């Protein structure tokens, strides 16, 4: 392969970085003061080497790497699976040993090696036999908690592996009996009714179905604490509920059992074939008359997501009801992965329900999105109070006329991509009519009419321009800048009319109005109060005939004054008249023929059906396909803090109080109880919890205690005497329960690195990790003086929404064309040299683009990673940061939190918005989906410097969210699967807009449309992408939620059902019944049942009393007793409730139910203590 | 005769064509068979006569 | 959940039954008078008051059931937990107290009682004689301990008490005619299991539609009738009850009771008392129906509304009545004592004198400064039900009557395997206050 010389330059500069960072973190870890002599970091460049580095066995990667190129990725996990077997990487001992390895590692090589389901979700492997049928061996496997959080993709590639490993290794089948069936029944159908909703829910008959014909068992330790009713099944120790098998038994193998069977038989497994059968067995009249019947029968309304309403999140359109989103294919600059474009102008009209980074909850192409600023395409058409109707297409007009607003006819549009159509596997719906596509049919009409070649979208030859420019009568230099920029340079009306009348192409769809949006008897109405009643401008172009202006009086219009709302015709009100202006008198009356055929209702015809008989201008449907949404889980750009904010990893007990403060402990001199580890000086014989000796100078050595006769052994002699006690016989442990005095360690601390002036020191009540080995309280005290926290590993995290970016304009960012080149970059998308700041870059796979929040936590780390290096370890500076866009060209790591490895970044700018910007295959690589997703950055030198595998907690799961190994290079290869379907063409071609008319499957034109998967292998993988729809900026609109600016719910409903009456395609009465039914009367309910039952808590102690004590005091504090619920919390949310009933048309159970939890809660306290909804209700009947 | 021809030829132009054509392109076709001043004799008698009609000035249809 | 549109229904407007010209009913005076009701009794920051409220309940139910356990003459020399330390060695003494916890050992069991003065834990061991009685006594009931104290702070026991019925009774005198009543319960008007067949056979029998001789001198003779409890359906008592209901409105389901309970003949006398389903208190005790919902069956010139509970006296004798939610906590606690046999539980209940002791479980308990639920005099007859299962035990005297449901099998009660027993009555004799046939409609369901 040749690739073309800046890729590979690319690599080696961040190679070079790299390595820069590296001897640094070597140079000061190897002082002693850590508790490592070396970085505990590893890099990794592939697959191979983060196999090896994440589950073994030594020299796994050379054979990897022959066989994947021998035979592939699939077979080259077996291949390994059968070289281990056979002992060919040393000896293991047990068949239980080599059995754990070979499912580890080939379920590490099948997962890429990035999800940590291979190191934390498999707890055990081991070997059972069937005691109660046969007493033969059979494999089982055991599961933990994290294996719920591994993606369903990898819990079912867990069976098939584990399945061969026992025909490997000469085992027998699984032979289960009727009560364990019945057992796994009980347990799923539990699960889900008590716990959490299974995101795929399976009947009782697939249970058994999956039960009776897996070769191996599933089974694990108890998760949750929820009795079963069967008990003392054989073979199971636990009575409680198993979470992690029923999880995957019920979102692998039967869930996605495609993919299962496509693994199954590109693999060549013998033996499943239940699951292919199961997979088998579960798979006159006008034009556009005829058309919305077969898109109603072939594509039936969904309203899986209106289904659940909280209040605060508005509901934004009704399933598949015109008014709402209109539907365009196409892939913006910030959009495609799963993101959607949506114009500012809508962010602002829907009170800022919406800002850059929130999630939708869709309905047609999948479950959610995330929205990014589009301007190119349309935005909402709203009513004015005084009944004028306008189009907002841009954020200053929004932000202008937002006062007068009283209905919103329409929302806007939404762009949504055909790759997401391909991997959801969503029917095309048909396709509205576009600017592309009639720039498309105007080419073709020059072609075939005039045989003249022009291309939409590039520049074409001066000749064909001025032989076309000839022929037509128009200036060349605007068919120049119509034919590069279609979609924001039009034509004015007249030009359109004489490009219909000459060329033969229809009507420009700018100035289509929405003709099917009314019945034919409307427009007959309106055709004859026009020719009666109504005064006309009209006015000529050349020999063609257009209207100017039409005046008409309020009283004869009447009832037809809605046809025109509903037609989208912009129009005011003055003087009790209705004008409409130049450009949409035309629009208006062109397809009517100015009012010389007359217009009659036709049945089995629609509108456009009826005007495309007879006129010569011809329409096309402007908006025919609709899509719903609802809001949910708004943008994320902050910090990250345990629970308790942490600064240090020193454990300090009870002496601190509740917020755990070493200062204050320090203070009052108190002497705390702690279990922690000592060090021991070799030569002097100095004993404490730091690693260099305060006199000597020199290294100290572990201390291991015995439990039983507490004897102390340093490390050497534990190693001679291979940990275990002489006199004992007992396994010796590294930690015991010792008494600390915490001022003169913090006044050591203070003296040693000259920070006196703090005054909160936050540390934690008790060590997680088996070692128990603490952090140095200097950090902690330079972390406490530049105000930053740390979390479980030593690490300084921020977490951040993620969306895509592929391209992007260097004035978005604020960086100058120098520092560009300065970075590498000397070009553009169209291969012109770069000079200006308004051309269009196109985004190298691990350059990142950070948000201004980020950008002000990292100048806070940067500082505490200088002081540290300058006090602490007495070396040079290494950032030297001012303001936040002195990091630019420094590197992070990115992390998910399902992960257990990394990738390492550049920052080349920021923005003002709260997300995280960058490349497609970024995100990728962390297996990850822009649909609303968090993941986290950090700086690269403080990890190395900080990092230490001593503090990770020793339960399952304590290595999920840890950088255990980085990824140096991005290979698209080895990223993931859905950003394989991802579009890179520049304009979607006739083909698929003729095809989109016949609901065809997005499976039958991958080959028609470019996809990410079709440059695989070949060099042209890395540079070359392409966009459909530009944007002028990718930070314009609103950046906080309203949500987050309401405290109180009835203020939150207020708006909610504001924002549901202003909206034409939402049912304020519906949005009404939802709230109850879903988050008030619930609450209510529940609180009211739980205020007789609950407990009593005393408030110096914390003692709980299941009955309240009878002298009213605590027995042992004599402190006052308080409720746990109190009548406050049965009451909060009853005045919307009955302000909801009282002004809404909702049910009669609803009322009934409302106004008897009134009376309830007002019956309940009796003994302690005319045009109202309730009197009027018991007075009617 | 030659205008006889001629008259025959332009409708079989404007019959294949379906729409309406700009003067030039029957000019530069037609051009070399023949003269300017015919060409434009031909379009004002076919006119006249009536079988086509015009709709925006410059442009030719049936 | 998910309304749907709405539905067409009946009332049983046009149900008419009349009187037998055969059957000729005796002519007896009628003595009835409620002994007990709730509503005959007068009883800044809110948690305060709601504690205070609480404790008041609590030592309210302690002072009465002391009052209750002190009757028994073998209970004598009774000291305060506070004044233990005053307790000689050999000296024996006894205390009374509430149950907190009750653990279970090897060699006996370990209580915690707490009286108004303090806490002692207490130690019966494994071999004492009344020991299977302490191994069954739920937590908040007032029990009795006797022994000997120890400086280290245990207390030694050696006996145990409950307060009980008395074990001798005085016959009361005859009565000059026989007269019958009738007891049932769970009615569920508006249910899609409602049996309606079972119920206009059952209102046919009392108008003097029978076949048989001993029928005919029984329905002549029946002069009260009384229900307990769950005599609609209620709106919302679970999710998904819309599609579950018939007649999904309050006021159309007390209408349509109404409607099918006026062809009850003249000279019957009922007794309605609210249950958990119906438009009343969300916690016992429950002074009675909303009068603004449950308008039409206060009209009925026959019918007196009563409490839960509520002791209503018939020809001298005492008939407690109470919708029976308690006996779920017994259930649950001790083991043997299933479903089916709703008896043994109530057995319990009553030798604890307390019809729902536990408080935290499944029974909610309203703050009331009195407690109001403790049996204060014994009875001659009790009745209960929200178990839908019939049966009938006699302890000491007193009978125990559960009512049966009208209500078919759910999908509720198929699922938790419980199996009802519609459409079962039973007559009791006033003379001698036992229960002296079951009349059985399950042929028409
Ligand atoms: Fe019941
Ligand atoms: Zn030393
Ligand atoms: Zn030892
Ligand atoms: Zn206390």
Redesign the pocket.
Known sequence: MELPKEMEEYFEMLQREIDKAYEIAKKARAQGKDPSLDVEIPQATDMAGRVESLVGPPGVAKRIRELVKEYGKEIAALKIVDEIIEGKFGDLGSREKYAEQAVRTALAILTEGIVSAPIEGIANVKIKRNTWADNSEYLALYYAGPIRSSGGTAQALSVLVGDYVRRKLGLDRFKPSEKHIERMVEEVDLYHRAVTRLQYHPSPEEVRLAMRNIPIEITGEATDDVEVSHRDVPGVETNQLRGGAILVLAEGVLQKAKKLVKYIDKMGIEGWEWLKEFVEAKEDMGFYYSLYQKFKEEIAPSDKYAKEVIGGRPLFSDPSKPGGFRLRYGRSRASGFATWGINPATMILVDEFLAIGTQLKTERPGKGAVVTPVTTIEGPIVKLKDGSVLRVDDYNLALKVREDVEEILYLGDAVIAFGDFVENNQTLLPANYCEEWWILEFVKALKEIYEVHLEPFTENEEESIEEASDYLEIDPEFLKEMLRDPLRVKPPVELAIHFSEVLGIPLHPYYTLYWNSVEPKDVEKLWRLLKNYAEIEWSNFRGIKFAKKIVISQEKLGDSKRTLELLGLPHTVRDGNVIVDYPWAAALLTPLGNLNWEFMAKPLYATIDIINENNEIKLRDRGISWIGARMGRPEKAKERKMKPPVQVLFPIGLAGGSSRDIKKAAEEGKVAEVEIAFFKCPKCGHVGPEHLCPNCGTRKELLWV?P??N?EYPESQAEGYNYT?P??N?KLRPYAKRKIRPSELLNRAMENVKVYGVDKLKGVMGMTSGWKMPEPLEKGLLRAKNDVYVFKDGTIRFDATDAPITHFRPREIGVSVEKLRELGYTHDFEGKPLVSEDQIVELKPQDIILSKEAGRYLLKVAKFVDDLLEKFYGLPRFYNAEKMEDLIGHLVIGLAPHTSAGIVGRIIGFVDALVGYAHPYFHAAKRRNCDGDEDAVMLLLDALLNFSRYYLPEKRGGKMDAPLVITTRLDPREVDSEVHNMDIVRYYPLEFYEATYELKSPKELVGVIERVEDRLGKPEMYYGLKFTHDTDDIALGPKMSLYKQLGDMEEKVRRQLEVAKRIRAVDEHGVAEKILNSHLIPDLRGNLRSFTRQEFRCVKCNTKFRRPPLNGKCPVCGGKIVLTVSKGAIEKYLGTAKMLVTEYNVKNYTRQRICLTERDIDSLFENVFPNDICQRLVMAR | ELLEKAKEDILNILRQKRTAISRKYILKKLGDKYDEETIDDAITELLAQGEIYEPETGYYKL | EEIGEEKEYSKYEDVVIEWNPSVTPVQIEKNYEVKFDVRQVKLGKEGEIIVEAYASLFKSRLSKLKRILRENPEISNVVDIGKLNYVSGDEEVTIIGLVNSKRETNRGLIFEVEDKTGIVKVFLPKDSEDYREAFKVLPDAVVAFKGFYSKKGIFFANKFYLPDVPLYRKQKPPLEEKVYAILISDIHVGSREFCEKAFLKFLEWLNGHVESKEEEEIVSRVKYLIIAGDVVDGIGIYPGQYSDLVIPDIFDQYEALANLLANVPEHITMFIGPGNADAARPAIPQPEFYKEYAKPIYKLKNAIIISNPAVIRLHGRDFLIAHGRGIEDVVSFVPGLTHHKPGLPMVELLKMRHLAPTFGGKVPIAPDPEDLLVIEEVPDLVQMGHVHVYDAVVYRGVQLVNSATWQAQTEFQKMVNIVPTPAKVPVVDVESARVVKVLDFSGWC
């Open positions: 015995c039983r006769c004897a006690c006199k004992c007992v």
